[PDB]
A paper describes a structure:
SARS-CoV-2 ORF8 is a 121-amino acid (aa) protein consisting of an N-terminal signal sequence followed by a predicted Ig-like fold. The accessory protein ORF8 is one of the most rapidly evolving betacoronavirus proteins (1–7). ORF8 disrupts IFN-I signaling when exogenously overexpressed in cells. It has been shown that ORF8 of SARS-CoV-2, but not ORF8 or ORF8a/ORF8b of SARS-CoV, down-regulates MHC-I in cells. The structure of the SARS-CoV-2 ORF8 protein reveals two novel intermolecular interfaces layered onto an ORF7 fold.
The structure of SARS-CoV-2 ORF8 was determined by X-ray crystallography at a resolution of 2.04 Å. ORF8 crystallized as a covalent dimer with three sets of intramolecular disulfide bonds per monomer and a single intermolecular disulfide bond formed by Cys20 of each monomer. The core of each ORF8 monomer consists of two antiparallel β-sheets. Punctuated between what would be β3 and β5 of ORF7a is an ORF8-specific region of ∼35 aa from residues 46 to 83 that are structurally distinct from ORF7a and other Ig-like folds. These residues are responsible for a third, ORF8-specific, disulfide. The dimeric interface amounts to ∼1,320 Å2 in buried surface area. Val117 forms a hydrophobic interaction with its symmetry-related counterpart. This central hydrophobic region is flanked by salt bridges between Arg115 and Asp119. The ends of the interface are stabilized by a “clamp” loop which makes main-chain hydrogen bonding interactions between Phe120 of one subunit and Ala51 and Arg52 of the other. The structure reported here is of the Leu84 form.
Author numbering:
A (entry chain B): 18 to 65, 69 to 121
B (entry chain A): 18 to 64, 67 to 121
The structure:
């Protein structure tokens, strides 16, 4: 149950500081409604993992590095999943929250 | 200790776990728009005349003893607790409280 508080300028691009340990693999998600029993929507799916989610709005500026238009997401919470192994069977989640300058 | 992630059932009262260290005094605030340069609105202070005044239409603050909220993110801004060792709150650190919903 870790939290990552970061600061950026509202409505401007912000390269999100990845709070996963170094050399961990990370996947970025929206947790719908910030409800833990709700779906985790994966962001920045290149193709195909199985479902690609595209955003109507401008939340995502870039997927490399993961860069957002500095704002709190309304659909749910911004969560990063950290895993040492590529299969992601053992992992930990960190929620990312913004203070605005 | 800058962020405190907590879990509750949405739209039901939640006694907020105070994340200040033990023996510290705590005051609860909304930071308007979560903007560091914006006003801090103190909760559980309800004493008057002023051109801008803040009301709680949805009973976001359920109780001030213990500090208990309607389990929700306040739209006006972020929930912040100011922790101070001294009663004068001259030396302090703020902790933002964030909710995951059950
Ligand atoms: Na929320």
């Amino acid at each position: 149950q870790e939290c990552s508080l970061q600061s950026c300028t509202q409505h401007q691009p912000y390269v999100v500081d990845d709070p996963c340990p170094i050399h961990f693999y990370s996947k970025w998600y929206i947790r719908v409604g910030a409800r833990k029993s709700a779906p985790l929507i994966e962001l920045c799916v290149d193709e195909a993992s199985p479902i690609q989610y595209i955003d109507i709005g401008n939340y995502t500026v870039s997927c490399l590095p993961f860069t957002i238009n500095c704002q709190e997401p309304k659909l749910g919470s911004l969560v990063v999943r950290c895993s040492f192994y590529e299969d992601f069977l053992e992992y930990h989640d960190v929620r990312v929250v913004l203070d605005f300058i």
